[PDB]
Design a protein around this ligand. Structure first.
Ligand SMILES: Nc1ncnc2c1ncn2[C@@H]1O[C@H](COP(=O)(O)OP(=O)(O)CP(=O)(O)O)[C@@H](O)[C@H]1O
Ligand SMILES: Nc1ncnc2c1ncn2[C@@H]1O[C@H](COP(=O)(O)OP(=O)(O)CP(=O)(O)O)[C@@H](O)[C@H]1O
Ligand SMILES: [Mn+2]
Ligand SMILES: [Mn+2]
Lengths: 181, 177
C-alpha cells in the first residue's frame, strides 16, 4: 500500500460524537474502539467517516435501549458499542457492534409484504440473511440521502463489501471489508 | 393537474447509464432516488431527453477514468445520482456526479470565441457568470442551452453548481399544479 495512514485519523473523532449522540437520545453507552493503529489507504480514511458515523448513530438510536428498558429486560444497564478495525488476509475489516435490542426482523418481513415484494407463504421461507438484506435495497426503509443504502454504496465505491448480522435482544454487528491497495 | 410517478421518466435510465459507462470505459455507480415522486403527466415526454443528456454529460465529461480517480485520491468508482422530490409546490430533480467538474477555463474560451464576451471581461467573471454561458442559446456545439430552454418551456428553472475535481450538480425545479 502506497499512502497508508492509521485509521485513528478517522476514529479519534467518534468518542465525542458518540457521547453527544447518546446524551441527545437519552441513552447510556460505553464506547470501545479497537485497532486504532490499523493502517489503510488514506483515501478510505477520508471517505469512511460518514458511513461509520451513520452505523454508530443507528446503533445508538435503534440498537441500544434506554437504561430503564435494559434494566426491565434483565440486561446490563449500560449499553456497549464497539468500533474496531483489523486485518483479515488482504482485507481491512471494520466492525460496528452493539449489544442492543437487535434488528427487528419481523418488521422487515411485514414491510416487504406490504410492498408486495413477497407474500406470507414466501415470507415464511426466508432466511435471516435474506431478511436483513432488504435493508440494503434502495428505497426500502422510510426516510425524512442517508441510510443503509448510502452506507453500502459508499463502501462499494471503494470496492469494499458490507454485511450485517443480528440476534433479537442480543445486538447487531455491521461488518465492512476494505481491499488492500 | 393529472399526475404520474416520475418513474415513467426514470425507468429507462439505469440501462442507458450502464451501457454508456461501459462504452466510454468508466466505472460508475448509478443511484436513483425518489422515483415515486409525482409530476404533471404532460412533463414526462418533454423532460426525458434533457435528463438523459445531463446523465450522459456526467458519464462522458464528469466521471474520470479509474487511474485518474486514483491519482486524485477519490473513490475508484464514480457516483452518479439522479433524484426527485417535492419541495413546496414544485418537483425538484437533481443530477449529481463526483467527477472532475466543469472546465470553466474552457467555457470562457468558448464564450469569447462565440462573441458572447470580450476577453477583457473574462478575468473578473464570477463562477455563476461563467456557468450561465452554458444556458446561452447556440452555446453548445441537444446541449445545456436546449436543456435550459425545455425547462423554461415548462415554466420551471434550472441551476448549476460545480467545483474542479469535486463534481457537478444540476438542479431542475418544475411547478406542480
Ligand atoms: N444497530 C441497529 N439495531 C437495531 N436496528 C437497526 C440497527 N441499525 C439499523 N436498524 C434497523 O434498520 C432500519 C434502517 O436503518 P437505515 O439506517 O437504513 O434507516 P433509518 O431508519 O435509520 C432512517 P435514516 O437512515 O434516513 O436516518 C432501521 O429503521 C432499524 O429498524
Ligand atoms: N457533468 C459534467 N462534468 C464535467 N463537465 C461537464 C458536465 N456537464 C457538462 N460539462 C462541460 O460543459 C460543456 C457543455 O455541455 P453541453 O451539454 O452544453 O454541451 P456538449 O458540447 O458537451 C454536447 P455533447 O458533448 O453532448 O456533444 C461541455 O462541453 C463539458 O466540457
Ligand atoms: Mn439510519
Ligand atoms: Mn454535452
Amino acid at each position: 500500500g502506497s499512502h497508508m495512514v492509521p485509521i485513528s485519523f478517522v476514529f479519534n473523532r467518534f468518542p465525542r460524537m458518540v457521547r453527544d449522540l447518546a446524551k441527545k437520545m437519552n441513552k447510556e453507552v460505553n464506547f470501545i474502539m479497537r485497532g486504532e493503529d490499523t493502517e489503510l489507504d488514506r483515501t478510505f480514511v477520508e471517505e469512511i467517516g460518514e458511513p461509520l458515523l451513520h452505523l454508530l448513530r443507528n446503533a445508538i438510536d435503534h440498537g441500544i435501549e434506554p437504561k430503564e428498558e435494559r434494566i426491565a429486560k434483565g440486561k446490563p444497564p449500560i449499553g456497549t458499542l464497539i468500533l474496531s478495525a483489523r486485518h483479515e488476509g488482504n482485507n481491512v475489516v471494520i466492525e460496528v457492534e452493539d449489544d442492543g435490542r437487535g434488528i427487528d426482523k419481523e418488521k422487515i418481513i411485514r414491510k416487504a409484504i406490504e410492498k408486495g415484494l413477497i407474500d406470507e407463504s414466501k415470507a415464511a421461507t426466508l432466511s435471516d440473511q435474506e431478511i436483513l438484506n432488504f435493508l440494503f435495497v434502495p428505497g426500502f426503509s422510510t426516510k425524512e440521502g442517508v441510510g443503509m443504502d448510502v452506507v453500502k454504496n459508499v463502501v462499494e465505491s471503494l470496492n469494499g463489501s458490507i454485511s450485517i448480522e443480528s440476534e433479537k435482544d442480543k445486538g447487531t454487528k455491521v461488518t465492512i471489508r476494505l481491499p488492500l491497495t
